[PDB]
Amino acid sequence: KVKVGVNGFGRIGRLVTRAAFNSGKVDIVAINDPFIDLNYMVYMFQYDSTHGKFHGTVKAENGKLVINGNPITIFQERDPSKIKWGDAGAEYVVESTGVFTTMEKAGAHLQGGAKRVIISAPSADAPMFVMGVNHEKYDNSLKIISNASCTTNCLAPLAKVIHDNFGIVEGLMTTVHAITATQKTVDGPSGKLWRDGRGALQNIIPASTGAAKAVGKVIPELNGKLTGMAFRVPTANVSVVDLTCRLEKPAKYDDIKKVVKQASEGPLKGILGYTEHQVVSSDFNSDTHSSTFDAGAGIALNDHFVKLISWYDNEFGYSNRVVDLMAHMASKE
Amino acid sequence: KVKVGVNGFGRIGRLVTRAAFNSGKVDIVAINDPFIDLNYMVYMFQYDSTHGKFHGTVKAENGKLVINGNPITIFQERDPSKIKWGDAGAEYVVESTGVFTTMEKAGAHLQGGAKRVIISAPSADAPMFVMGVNHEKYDNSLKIISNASCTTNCLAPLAKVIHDNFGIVEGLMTTVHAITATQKTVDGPSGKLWRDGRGALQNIIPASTGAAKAVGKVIPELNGKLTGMAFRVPTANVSVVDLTCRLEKPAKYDDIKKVVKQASEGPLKGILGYTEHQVVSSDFNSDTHSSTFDAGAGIALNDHFVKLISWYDNEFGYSNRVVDLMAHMASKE
Amino acid sequence: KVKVGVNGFGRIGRLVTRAAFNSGKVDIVAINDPFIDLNYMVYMFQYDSTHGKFHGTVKAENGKLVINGNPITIFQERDPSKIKWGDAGAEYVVESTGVFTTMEKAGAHLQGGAKRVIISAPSADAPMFVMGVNHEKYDNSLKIISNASCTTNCLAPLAKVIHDNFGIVEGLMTTVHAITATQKTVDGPSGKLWRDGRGALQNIIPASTGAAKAVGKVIPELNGKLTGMAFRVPTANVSVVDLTCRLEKPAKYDDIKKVVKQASEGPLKGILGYTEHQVVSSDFNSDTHSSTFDAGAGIALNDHFVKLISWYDNEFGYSNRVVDLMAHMASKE
Amino acid sequence: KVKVGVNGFGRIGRLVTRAAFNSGKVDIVAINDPFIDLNYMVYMFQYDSTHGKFHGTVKAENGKLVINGNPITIFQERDPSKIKWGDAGAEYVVESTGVFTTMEKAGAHLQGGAKRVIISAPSADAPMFVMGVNHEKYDNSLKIISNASCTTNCLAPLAKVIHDNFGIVEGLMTTVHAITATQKTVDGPSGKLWRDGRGALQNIIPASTGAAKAVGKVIPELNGKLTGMAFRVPTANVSVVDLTCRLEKPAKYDDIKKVVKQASEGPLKGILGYTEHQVVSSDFNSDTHSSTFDAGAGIALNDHFVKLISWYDNEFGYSNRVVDLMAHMASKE
Ligand SMILES: NC(=O)c1ccc[n+]([C@@H]2O[C@H](COP(=O)([O-])OP(=O)(O)OC[C@H]3O[C@@H](n4cnc5c(N)ncnc54)[C@H](O)[C@@H]3O)[C@@H](O)[C@H]2O)c1
Ligand SMILES: NC(=O)c1ccc[n+]([C@@H]2O[C@H](COP(=O)([O-])OP(=O)(O)OC[C@H]3O[C@@H](n4cnc5c(N)ncnc54)[C@H](O)[C@@H]3O)[C@@H](O)[C@H]2O)c1
Ligand SMILES: NC(=O)c1ccc[n+]([C@@H]2O[C@H](COP(=O)([O-])OP(=O)(O)OC[C@H]3O[C@@H](n4cnc5c(N)ncnc54)[C@H](O)[C@@H]3O)[C@@H](O)[C@H]2O)c1
Ligand SMILES: NC(=O)c1ccc[n+]([C@@H]2O[C@H](COP(=O)([O-])OP(=O)(O)OC[C@H]3O[C@@H](n4cnc5c(N)ncnc54)[C@H](O)[C@@H]3O)[C@@H](O)[C@H]2O)c1
C-alpha cells in the first residue's frame, strides 16, 4: 500500500484525502499547507458545506492530524523543495496547490525525498492521464505526471466511447461549471481573466478552458478535432458537459445510448456512468463517477450531428480519480 | 396610436405594460387578471426585484389603474370570452397568461370586442413572428398571431445574419436560461416535465425547448436544419444562447464578427446587438435587445465549424419586441 | 406498531415518510396526493436535492408504492372526507397539505376511518404540541392535534430551559429562515402576504410568524411575554433562531451554557442540542434535532439581557418530531 | 471644491468615485491600486454587477483615467507613504483598502502630501463620524478620521432618533448582511474568523461586529448600552438591521412611526429614510440612504420592549456618506 503526501489542503487536497481514507487504496501519511495549521486542518476536514460532515474521526494529537486513527505528519512549508517528504515516508506526492503545475516546479517535491508527483491539474509539459482512457500508457520511468482537469476527465471517457464506435470528425463542447475557489463573491480583481473577477453569485460568466483540446492529448486520434469553452454559473458544485459533434459513421440516438450503456457496464464501470432518469445537477452530489451520460437530456439533429450531455461532480469525481490513478501507479512499481 | 389590452399581469404582462408606457409606441387601456386585484396590481407594477422600481406614477383611482396619469380599466375575468375589451376600447390584446396559446383559445378575446390578439409565447397553430426577421410578412388578414418565444427572438436574428452570409448547413443550440415563474423554490410537483419541478435554487436543470426548431418557421430555409435544448440555472434573469453550426461557405471568425457588427449597425439595429467587451450576464439587465452577439466568448474550430454566443434579457428584450410588433401592426391598419 | 397514512406528499409529507421508514417507530401504510401519481411519487421520494438520494428501495408495484419492501396504498383524492383510510388500515393520519389546518377541515379524515389526525403545521383551534416541552399533556380524548411549526419546535425547547432556570420576563425573536415551497422563483403573485411573492433567490424578505406567540401555548407561563418575526433568505434549507430576552434571575453567559448543555445531555437529548463548534447553517443539514444551541454565536449585554442563537433543519428536525409524536401517542393507546 | 484621492479601487473605492462624479460634491483627481492597472480600472469602473453600467464616459487616455472628461492620475504603490498625492493635487485621501485602518498606518498618506485622510472603515484609534449623528463634532485639528462602518451608519441614525425621543435603556442588534469581498465562494482559508471562510453561497454565517458597540462612540449616552452580532446570507448587496431595545419612556409603535417619519422629513432627510411600503431587500438597490426605517416589518411586545427594522444598501449608502462627509469637512477649511 503506497504512502501518500498531499501538498495543498484545499478542496481537492482535502477531498483526495477524504477519498483515500474511504477506499483505503492508498495511505495519506503527510500533508503540507502553510496557510492552514493543524487545528484549522481538523475543522476544514471535518466540516464540509457541499459534501457533509466527515464520517469518521479527525483530531489533532501530538502535533499530528489523526484521521480514523491514522497519524499524519503536518508540514507548513511555502517552498516545495523544503518539504521533508522522505522523513514522513511519503512516496507519492499530490500537487494540488494550483501553483506548481509545470514539470519543473512540481519537481521540487523530489528534492524532499518524494519518488513521484501527481499534479491534480492540467500541466503545460508533464504527461497527462485520464483513468479509463490512457492510464495504461503510464510506466515507471515517469516521476512527474498530471491527472488532467475535472472537465477533461468528464469529456475524454465519453469521447472515447463515441469515437471508437462512430468516429468523431469534429466537435465543440461547452461546460456549465459550478463556481470554484478561483472566483469572487462580488466584483473584484480577477486573477488572470477579467470576466472571472465578476461576482460569482450574480452572473453567468463565460470562461475559456483547454479541456476539449486536452482530450487530443489523451486520445491522439482526436487531436485537433475538438475545442470548446465554459460558462461559470452560481452553484456550489457539480457540472455538466455539452458535446456537439459530427459523426463519421451514421448512428441513431438509440444506438449511441446502447453503446454508452455497454461501456458503463464493462471497462469504464465506475468511470463513465449512464442514466435515463430525469436527473438534475444535485442528483450527482458526491457521485464518484468521472462522467455520467444523460440519455434523456441529449438531442440529435440527424444521424451525423448530435448533442451529448454528461454530468460530473467536479470535486468528488476528480478526487477519486487521483486516488485511483495512484493505486494504478503503485501496482506498477 | 393603437389602444392595447393586456391579459395576464405577470412578468411579461407587467413588463410589456412597463415597456409600452416608456416608448409610448402603444397605449395600454385595459388589463385583466383574476388573481390580482387593483391594489395588488399597483404594488406589483411599482416594485420589481429584477428591474427596479418603476420610474413614474402608479395608483389606484376610481377603480382604475393610473400609470403616468393614464387611467387603465381593470378586469377580473377567468374566462377570456367574457372580458369586455370593446367597452374599454382595447383594439389589440396581448395574451400573456401562458394558458391560451392556441389559435382557438386565444381567439376568445375577439368575442369581447378585440380586433387582434398577440400571444406572448409560441403557438401550436397561430403564425409566429420575430421583429427584424419576418415581421414584414405580417398582414391585416391575421387576427391572431404569436411573437414566438424569448429564446427564438434571440436565436433567429443571429441565425439570419449567419445564414444570409455563410449559409447554415446544420446547427444545434443550447441555452443557459435564468429561472422563471414556472419553476419551484424546492423539489415539488411539476407542471409538465419531471425535472422542472426540482429546486430551482439548487440545480442546473436540463430542459427541452422548441426554440431552435421554431427558427425554421420564421426562416423557412433553416427549417429542419436546427434543434437544441436548454439548461435552467439559478439566476433571476438574463440568458445566453450557444449556437454550434456548420457553415456552407468558409468564414474566419473575424469575418463573422465583421458581418454581425454591420448587421447591428444597420437593419437589425436595436434587435441584434454586438460587443467585444468582457461582459457577464448582469451586464444585460434591462437591456432591450432581442439578442447580443458576444465576440470574445465565441470560438471556432475551423472555417466551417463554429460556436457563436449571444446574450438576451429574456424579460425585457421580449417585452419590448411585443410592443415593437404591435407598433408595426398598427402602422399597417 | 401504529399504522400511518400521509395526506400530502410534499417536503414534509415525503420527509415524514422517510423518517418513519428509518426509525421504524411507525409504519406508513397509505399516502394521498391528487397532484402526484404513483410513478411520480417514486421519483420524488427517491431523489432529493437537499437531503440526498433515499438509502433504500422505492418502487411502483401492483399500483402500490413499495419502500424497503413495504407496500403502501396510494390515494388520489382532493377531498379529505373521501379518502378510504380505514380500508388501507391507517390509524393515524398526518395532515401535511397545508390546506386543512383547522380542527374542522382536518377532521374530514375521521370520516374515512382514521382514528387520529396530526396536523403538520400550526392550527387555529386544534391543541398544539412540541416534543420535550408539553407532549406529556397529550391524552386519548384528543382525535385532532397539531405539532406546531418548524420554528416553534426550535424556540420552545430553548425557551423552556431558559425560563425554568432564570425566568423569561419578556422576549423578542427573529428567525432567518430558508426558502420554502410557498415562495416564488421570481416576482409573482403571493399566496397571502405581498412581500412573500417577491423573488426568493434575489431578496431578504421580511415575514411575520406566530411561532414566538405560539410558545405561549405550549408553555403557558410564557404566554404573552414573547413575539417576533422572520426573514426569508436565499438558502434551500436549515434556519436559525435569534432569541433576545430579559432574565428575571441574573445569569452569566457561561451559566446559560452550562444549563443548556445539561438539558441536552438529559431530558431533551435528541430534541435540544448544544455546540461550541464554529458552525454554519449547512453543518445542520439532515440534522434531526428540533433546536441546537450555538454557544459561540450568542452574546450577552449584561446578566439580564442576552441574545441566544439556535439552529434547526426546518425540514428534517420537524419531520422526525412528527414521527416521535405519533410514536408517543401510540404508546398511550 | 476639494480635490480627492482614493486609495484602493475596490467596491468602496469605486463606488465612492462613482458617487463623487454624480453629486459633484468633491473632485476625484487621483487613485492608487497596485493590483489594478489603468485599463483594468476602466473595465471595473464601467461595468458593475450590482449597480449597473456607469452612466457616463470612462477611458484610458495619456496614462490617465478619464471619467466624464475629468483626467485622473493613477498610482500603483503598495506602500502608502510612497504615493505622490501632493503632485496630483489630492488634498483629501480616502483610505479604502481595509489594510490601513489605524491612525498610524493611514497617516502614511500625509507623507505624500495629503492634508487629510478619511478611513472608509472603523478604526481602533482614529475619531469616528456618522453623517447626521455627530459630524458637527468634526474640526480642522483632525487630520485622520474614520467614517465608521456600513452597519454603524445604519444603526446610529435610527438609535439617535429613538434615544432622543424615548431613551434607550439597553439594546441588542442583529444584522442580516449581504456577502462581501471578504468571503469565499467555497469552503476555504478565512482571513481571520473560522466561520467566515465557509462557502458564502451555501451558508448563513454567524459573524461578530463592533457596529452596535461603535454607536456608543458617536452617541456617548448609548455607550455600553448596545451590542450585537451579524449573519452573512447569500445575497450580493443590501443589508438589514434588527434592533431590539428597552425604552425608558413608554411609546406605542405608532408613536415611534410618527417620530421616525418626522426625523426623515427634517434634519436626517437623505440619511434616515422611512417607509410603510411592503418592501424587500432589492427595493433598496442603489439607494443612497444610510438607513431606512421599515414600519411594517417591525414589531412591539409592549410599550417598553420593541424590535425595529431598518434597511441599507451597504455599498451605495456608505459610499455617499464618505462623499457627504468630505463635502462637510471641506466647508470647514
Ligand atoms: N475546485 C475543483 O472543483 C477542482 C476539480 C479538479 C481539479 N482542480 C485543480 O486542483 C487544484 C486544486 O484546486 P482546489 O479547488 O482544491 O483549490 P483550493 O484553493 O481550495 O486549494 C488550494 C490549497 O493550496 C494551499 N496552498 C496555497 N499555496 C500553497 C503553497 N505554496 N504550498 C502548499 N500549499 C499551498 C491553500 O492553502 C489551499 O488549501 C487547482 O489547480 C484546480 O485547477 C480543482
Ligand atoms: N418569463 C419570461 O421571461 C418569458 C419570456 C418569453 C415568453 N414567456 C411566455 O409568456 C407567458 C408569460 O409568462 P410569465 O413569465 O409572465 O408568467 P407569470 O406567472 O409571471 O405571469 C402570468 C400571469 O397570468 C395570470 N393569469 C393566470 N390565469 C389567467 C387567466 N385565465 N386570465 C388572465 N390572467 C391569468 C397569473 O395570475 C399571472 O399574473 C408564458 O407563456 C411564458 O412561457 C415568458
Ligand atoms: N417546509 C418546511 O420546512 C416545513 C416545516 C414544518 C412544518 N411545515 C408545514 O407542513 C405542511 C407541509 O408543507 P411543505 O413544505 O411540505 O409543502 P409542499 O408544497 O412541499 O407539500 C404539500 C403537498 O400537498 C399536496 N397537496 C395539495 N393539495 C392537496 C390536497 N387537496 N389533498 C392532498 N394533498 C394535497 C401537494 O401536492 C404537495 O405535495 C405545511 O402546512 C407547512 O406549513 C413545513
Ligand atoms: N463592501 C462594502 O459594502 C462596505 C460598506 C462599508 C464599509 N466597508 C469597508 O471598506 C473597506 C473597503 O472594502 P471593499 O468592499 O471595497 O473591499 P475590496 O477588496 O472590494 O476593495 C479593496 C481594494 O484594495 C486594493 N488594495 C489592496 N492592497 C492595497 C494597497 N496596499 N494599496 C492600495 N490598494 C490596495 C484591492 O486591489 C481592492 O480593489 C473594507 O475595510 C470594508 O470593511 C465595506
The answer to whether D3 and D29 have CB atoms below 8 angstroms apart is yes
> Any binding-site annotation on A175?
no
Q: Residue C293 forms beta bridges with which residues? A: C274, C310
- Signed CA dihedral, C108, C113, C114, C115: sign only: positive
D57 CB burial (10 A radius; 0-12, 13-18, 19+) = exposed
The CA C7 to ligand 3 mean position distance, Å, reads 9
Kindly give the residue spans of alpha helices, DSSP state H, lying in A112-190. 150-166
For chains A and C, CB pairs below 8 A equal: 24
* CB within 8 Å: A301 and B225: yes
For residue C284, the chain D residue with the least C-alpha distance is D203
The answer to whether residues B205 and B252 touch, using CB atoms and an 8 Å cutoff, is no
Question: Who contacts B275 (Cβ-Cβ below 8 Å, separation ≥6)?
Answer: B292, B293, B294, B295
- Hey, which of D14, D18, D120, D324 would you mutate to test ligand 4's pocket, going by the most ligand atoms within 8 Å of its Cβ? D120
Q: Which residues, other chains included, contact D23 with Cβ-Cβ below 8 Å and sequence gap of 6+?
A: D320, D323, D327
Where in B152-298 does DSSP place strands (E)? Answer: 168-178, 205-208, 226-233, 239-247, 272-275, 291-294
- Distance CA(B283)–CA(D28), nearest Å, equals 25
The answer to whether residue B319 neighbours chain C at the CB level (below 8 Å) is no
- The rounded distance, in Å, linking the Cα atoms of B310 and A204 is 12
- Cβ burial of D79 (10 Å; 0-12, 13-18, 19+) is exposed
Q: Is beta strand C205-208 parallel, antiparallel or unpaired with respect to C226-233?
A: antiparallel
Sheet of C27-32, strand order: C58-61, C64-67, C70-75, C27-32, C3-7, C92-95, C116-119, C144-146
Taking the Cβ of residue D201 and every Cβ of chain B, the question of whether any pair is shorter than 8 Å is answered with no
What CA dihedral angle connects D192, D194, D197 and D200, to 10 degrees?
A: -120
Burial class (CB in 10 A: 0-12, 13-18, 19+), D254: exposed
Task: Give me the long-range contacts of A293-299 (CB less than 8 A, separation at least 24).
Answer: A293/A158, A293/A257, A293/A260, A293/A261, A293/A264, A294/A240, A294/B206, A295/A257, A295/A260, A296/B206, A297/B206, A297/B229, A298/A253, A298/A256, A298/B229, A299/A253, A299/B172, A299/B208, A299/B227, A299/B228, A299/B229
Q: Which helix (H) or strand (E) holds C289?
A: none
Q: Which atom of ligand 4 lies closest to the CA of D11?
A: 16
Cell of D75: 498610482
Touching subunits of A (3+ CB pairs, under 8 Å) are B, C, D
Dihedral of alpha carbons B144, B150, B151, B154, sign: positive
Strand pairing of D239-247 and A3-7? Answer: unpaired
CA distance A270 to A254: 22
The three cell numbers locating residue C216: 405561549
Residue of A nearest to D194 (CA): A40
Nearby residues of B47 by Cβ (< 8 Å), 6 or more positions away: B53, B54, C187, C198, D277, D278, D279, D280, D283
Long-range contacts, stretch D108-113, CB < 8 angstroms, 24+ apart: D108/D79, D108/D80, D108/D81, D109/D5, D109/D7, D109/D80, D109/D81, D109/D83, D109/D85, D110/D143, D110/D144, D111/D80, D111/D81, D112/D80, D112/D81, D112/D82, D112/D83, D112/D84, D112/D85, D112/D86, D113/D84, D113/D85, D113/D86, D113/D87
> At the fourth CATH level, which superfamily is domain C1-147+315-333?
NAD(P)-binding Rossmann-like Domain (3.40.50.720)
The answer regarding whether domain C148-314 maps to CATH 3.30.360.10 reads yes
Residues 6+ apart with CB under 8 A from D287: D273, D311, D312, D313, D316, D317
Q: Do strands C27-32 and C3-7 pair parallel, antiparallel, or not at all (unpaired)?
A: parallel
CA-closest candidate to residue B58, choices B44, B42, B39:
B42
Question: Is D234's Cβ below 8 Å from some Cβ in A?
Answer: yes
Q: Tell me, yes or no, if B154 is annotated catalytic.
A: no
Residues of D in contact with A200 (CB under 8 A): 185, 201
CB of B305 within 8 Å of a chain D CB? The answer is no
On whether A232 is known to bind a ligand per the annotation, the reply is yes
Residues in the annotated binding site of D for D-glyceraldehyde 3-phosphate: 149-151, 180, 209-210, 232
C30-39 burial, b at 16+ Cβ within 10 Å, e below that, comes to bbbbeebebe
> Tell me, what amino acid is at A291?
S
What sign for the dihedral angle of Cα B201, B207, B210, B213? positive
Query: Does C296 sit in the ligand 2 pocket, CB within 6 Å?
Result: no
CB atoms within 10 A of CB C79: 10
Q: Are D128 and D148 in contact (CB under 8 A)?
A: yes
| Distance separating alpha carbons of residues D268 and B301, to the nearest angstrom | 61
Nearest in space to B156 (alpha carbons), one of B74, B98, B212: B212
CB proximity list for B306: less than 8 A, separation 6 or greater = A172, B244, B245, B247, B251, B253, B256, B298, B299, B300
Give ∠ CA A166-A170-A176 in degrees, rounded to 5.
100
Query: Ligand 4 centroid vs D96 CA: distance in angstroms?
Result: 5
Q: Which ligand ends up closest to the CA of D318?
A: 4
Residues 10-69 of chain D whose Cβ lies under 8 A from any Cβ of chain A: 10-11, 35-36, 40, 43-44, 47-50
Closest ligand (CA of B236): 2
% helix, strand, coil for chain C, step of 5: 30, 25, 40
| Beta-strand runs (E) in chain C | 3-7, 27-32, 58-61, 64-67, 70-75, 92-95, 116-119, 144-146, 168-178, 205-208, 226-233, 239-247, 272-275, 291-294, 299-300, 305-312
Backbone φ and ψ of D145, nearest 5°:
-130, 170
Which of the listed residues C35, C43, C209 should we mutate to test ligand 3's pocket, taking the one with most ligand atoms within 8 A of CB? C35
Written as one letter, the residue type at B112 is: G
Hey, are the CB atoms on A35 and D189 less than 8 Å from each other?
yes
Phi first, then psi: what are they for B15, rounded to 5°? -75, -25
Resolution, Å (one decimal): 2.5
Domain map (residue ranges) of chain D:
1-147+315-333, 148-314
Measured from CB, residues less than 6 Å from any atom of ligand 4 are A 188-189; D 7-13, 32-36, 78, 96-99, 120-121, 149-150, 180-181, 314-315, 318
Specify the experimental method.
X-ray
